[PDB]
Amino acid sequence: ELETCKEQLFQSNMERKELHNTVMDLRGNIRVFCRIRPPLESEENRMCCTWTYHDESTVELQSIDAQAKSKMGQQIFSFDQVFHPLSSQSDIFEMVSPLIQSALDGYNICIFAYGQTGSGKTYTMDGVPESVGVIPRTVDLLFDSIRGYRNLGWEYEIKATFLEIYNEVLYDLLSNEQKDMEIRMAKNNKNDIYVSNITEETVLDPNHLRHLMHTAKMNRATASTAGNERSSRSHAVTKLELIGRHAEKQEISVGSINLVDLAGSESPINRSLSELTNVILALLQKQDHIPYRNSKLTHLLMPSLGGNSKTLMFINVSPFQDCFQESVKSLRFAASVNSCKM
Amino acid sequence: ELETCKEQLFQSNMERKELHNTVMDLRGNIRVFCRIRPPLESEENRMCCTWTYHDESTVELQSIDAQAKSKMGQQIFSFDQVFHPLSSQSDIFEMVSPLIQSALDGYNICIFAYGQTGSGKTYTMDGVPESVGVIPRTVDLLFDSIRGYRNLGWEYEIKATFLEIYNEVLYDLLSNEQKDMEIRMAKNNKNDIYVSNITEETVLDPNHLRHLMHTAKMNRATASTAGNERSSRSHAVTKLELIGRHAEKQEISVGSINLVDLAGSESINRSLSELTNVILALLQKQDHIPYRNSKLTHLLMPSLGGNSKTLMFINVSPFQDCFQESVKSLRFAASVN
Ligand SMILES: Nc1ncnc2c1ncn2[C@@H]1O[C@H](COP(=O)(O)OP(=O)(O)O)[C@@H](O)[C@H]1O
Ligand SMILES: Nc1ncnc2c1ncn2[C@@H]1O[C@H](COP(=O)(O)OP(=O)(O)O)[C@@H](O)[C@H]1O
Ligand SMILES: [Mg+2]
Ligand SMILES: [Mg+2]
């Protein structure tokens, strides 16, 4: 008879699962966001732009130059939402926690931080000890959720791997034992991908994972020091694969989260950056063929840009005049996107 | 030990509830549908119209009068869905069943069948012993759901009341004791309404209620028999009130289902017209809704409110001679969304 609790507990969750993917689907599946960051004490003598916020999801930006102002015309863009200099980390996390539950439910996620250097990706994805980013929160939420699922029969296992992509070249950031990795078809799924030779530790709790994350950062030997042309010009893919198994019932749940702290989008490899973009738009257009294998980064995420996959995308921008010319570019991508979702 | 687990059930269900309403919301909350009925053996020599189906949620009608249709511009309308002559009762019910869940979760529902006489309203809401309508299936679905809910701690209680509105006059279809009934502010909710003197039976199962529905139908002894300007000119409000109580937790769930079998739409109309206004008035987020301008809009005031969910069926006849009317029916729909 208590089977009727556990069995119906198995059933309410099954229904909860569909309502949620349905909500997810109507809401989007490929949402684009914008994040604007407050200027720093070391930029108090820096020139801004004029941020006009027409409604909670649209924003127009204008060059404080009254002269150039004439030939530029208009600069107005909308998104599924917009975050302004007073928007907290916890704010941005609201837009993400749902996708986290989708992964536990068996769907692949992809959160990308994108923008020109200085914009705020690293701050967004990782954050800082004072105000943690998406990844740190994602982990806590992940372990909380997992904890509960036990009472339902599901035993979850997390499998983390951390790497970097610098010039169409992959780097395990968990080992210094310099090897040669390759993106290849997963043995039990020609559609899933697998990286050969990566360190794939199985997280034991927020701790063990915070560590691993630290390690990955160090081994990144982040020479943001001298000629940093490296870190600001390379992709950082953190992947957590969630494997849920229900014995005495069978069937498993497999969903993966891919937290990409993208390279800076500025100008004078871009092989990926550009390629990544094409792929994204190519989907929105239900295009027949997506060039996933045209770049190490799209090949690697191929299985999470798929059909049921859900993608977040943050465009970070600096509220500064000198940036402006870039700041606009970052947004245009956002504008070119939603023009396809039409 | 169950006290750590079953609580997760009340806790789980709770979240299902929150999500369903979220889906309901994005979907609509106020959806307008369209049903076209196929011609009968007694209409084989009747003139149809040109039913163009541009996509599964849009359709264009046209006067076979190459003469008239060349003088009108067009005849095109889209709904949240459209059902054609081949659409079954079970099809329509799929559009409804979700709202039945909302009811049990504590929201107010309203299903309206609407159109010119002879279009399909009575068929849709009540149906026939062969192909039952929305109301019959709502009761079955309502009792199944209830039956499972027990295991979650909730005890549900249904409370039916059937009435008719003829000329801004309310008739209790469950008693022949001819009394005077009034619409007034509920005691424990000034926004809620309560009719005085209505028989309010507490349904015990599909039977008890099917019975009551029959009674209600007999006690309707309309003039459709001898002077149809009656039945086909009055409103039939069936109302099931769902009250769920969770003891050893407190908290109750109060929701109602209002099944309205509207009166013919051809140009009394005090209500039918008013009803229309009110509907549209909501889609426009208007400041003040004139709920008390008609007997129907005042009875349903609480089930058209904020959270409230509303389904609107516009039945139409596939006939040339109905044409001019069939377009008016669709214009209302053209303005809703
Ligand atoms: N939202 C913010 N609030 C406060 N400081 C921020 C914010 N966003 C970015 N910063 C600051 O600037 C730095 C973050 O780097 P970032 O702009 O993420 O990299 P890139 O755009 O080169 O990938 C941090 O040292 C942090 O103090
Ligand atoms: N979908 C249908 N399939 C078969 N018969 C139908 C259908 N719709 C309506 N009818 C028929 O016509 C009658 C229904 O009346 P109705 O058109 O609902 O009323 P009004 O439009 O006057 O409110 C029934 O006797 C039924 O046989
Ligand atoms: Mg950075
Ligand atoms: Mg009728």
From Swiss-Prot, chain B:
Q: Which UniProt keywords apply?
A: ATP-binding, Cell cycle, Cell division, Coiled coil, Cytoplasm, Cytoskeleton, Hydrolase, Meiosis, Microtubule, Mitosis, Motor protein, Nucleotide-binding, Phosphoprotein
Q: Which GO terms describe its molecular function?
A: ATP binding; hydrolase activity; microtubule binding; minus-end-directed microtubule motor activity; protein homodimerization activity
Q: Which GO terms describe its cellular component?
A: centrosome; cytosol; meiotic spindle; mitotic spindle microtubule; nucleus; spindle
Kindly indicate whether the keyword Cell cycle belongs to this entry.
yes
Q: Where does ATP bind?
A: G115, Q116, T117, G118, S119, G120, K121, T122
The source's superkingdom equals Eukaryota
Task: Give the region (Required for minus-end directionality) as residue ranges.
Answer: 333-337
Q: Where is the Kinesin motor domain?
A: 29-337
Could you mention a single GO BP entry for this protein? mRNA transport
Name where it's found.
Cytoplasm, Cytoskeleton
The protein's role, per its UniProt record: Minus-end-directed microtubule-based motor protein. Has ATPase activity. Required for normal chromosomal segregation in meiosis in females, and in early mitotic divisions of the embryo.
Give the family per the record.
Belongs to the TRAFAC class myosin-kinesin ATPase superfamily. Kinesin family. NCD subfamily.
Recorded protein name is Protein claret segregational
Taxonomy, top ranks, is: Eukaryota, Metazoa, Ecdysozoa, Arthropoda, Hexapoda
